């Protein structure tokens, strides 16, 4: 029973960062070689575990979190980072044990007129707790006057779309990111290496 890593990594359509997708890998055999023997990843950073030892370890569960962000924001997907993506879209714990993998997606997620289906949360009062998912579309209140569900001055929609055009710079270009988190609990171990 091979673990379905390709379902996350080789998927046609990815998710927005404000609605990052999570898949639970359980009860399967995982070969991480396919991940650490590939040359298609711009970013491959594993915190708290080396990739080489990953095939020799057993875990209770694995979590694959996939989303699409900008290149300049890929640095925010790391322990102890600050920024719009880290604070309001996707927060990694300071004591994070897992692998962040990221590749360029200008060929698939950048369109000549601009791809406006990818969105990020722009306005939020408080920073996001680790592994939190805010999907609220409530109008943000920037002042004393209530919004009453109507956009206006000091009353803004919380989500803004990336302008993903193929002529953009690498920093403004889209990047697909998968975060692997390995969990071990006082429960039977279901994810094991070869």
């Amino acid at each position, epitope marked *: 029973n091979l673990c379905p890593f390709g379902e996350v990594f080789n998927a046609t359509r990815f998710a927005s960062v404000y609605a990052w997708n999570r898949k639970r890998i359980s009860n399967c055999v995982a070969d991480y070689s396919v991940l*650490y023997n590939s040359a298609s*990843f711009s970013t*491959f*950073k*594993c*915190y708290g*575990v*080396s*990739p*080489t030892k990953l095939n020799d370890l057993c875990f209770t569960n694995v979590y694959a979190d996939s989303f699409v962000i900008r290149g300049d924001e890929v640095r925010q997907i*790391a*322990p*102890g980072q*600050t920024g719009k993506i880290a604070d309001y879209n996707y927060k990694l714990p*300071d*004591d994070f044990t897992g692998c962040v993998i990221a590749w360029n997606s200008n060929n698939l997620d950048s369109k000549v007129g601009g791809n406006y289906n990818y969105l990020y949360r722009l306005f939020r009062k408080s920073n996001l707790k680790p592994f939190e998912r805010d999907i609220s579309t409530e109008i943000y209140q920037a002042g004393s006057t209530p919004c009453n569900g109507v956009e206006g001055f000091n009353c803004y929609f919380p989500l803004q779309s990336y302008g993903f055009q193929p002529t953009n710079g690498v920093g403004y270009q889209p990047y697909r990111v998968v975060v692997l988190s390995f969990e071990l609990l006082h429960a039977p171990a279901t994810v094991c290496g070869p």
Partner: nanobody
Amino acid sequence: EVQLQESGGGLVQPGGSLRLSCAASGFTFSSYAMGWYRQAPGKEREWVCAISGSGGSTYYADSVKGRFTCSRDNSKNTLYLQMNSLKPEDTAVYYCARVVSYYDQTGFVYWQSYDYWGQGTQVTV
């Protein structure tokens, strides 16, 4: 991460022994691994050492391995870098900050610094 002061010494003879100290406040010192960053005059900043919160894993660069020892006392929230067998190439300014480590695709370990700063000045070591 409210502040990080530094101490330890200045001008010192070659082949000598001296220890450099860093203080911390505003966070759990034992929770976060701390590292020493050395910036040479006219050269780029260089990571010399990194120590975990426990101290059970200490990492040193090949440029200085076998001579400097990095220690921490979580009781006083202080960071120590003991410098022995000193050579004129070790002449630089030293800085401390919270640090994190990652493994690349080929298994090698690199270090990333939490965005902050410690202010100090050294002119000879």
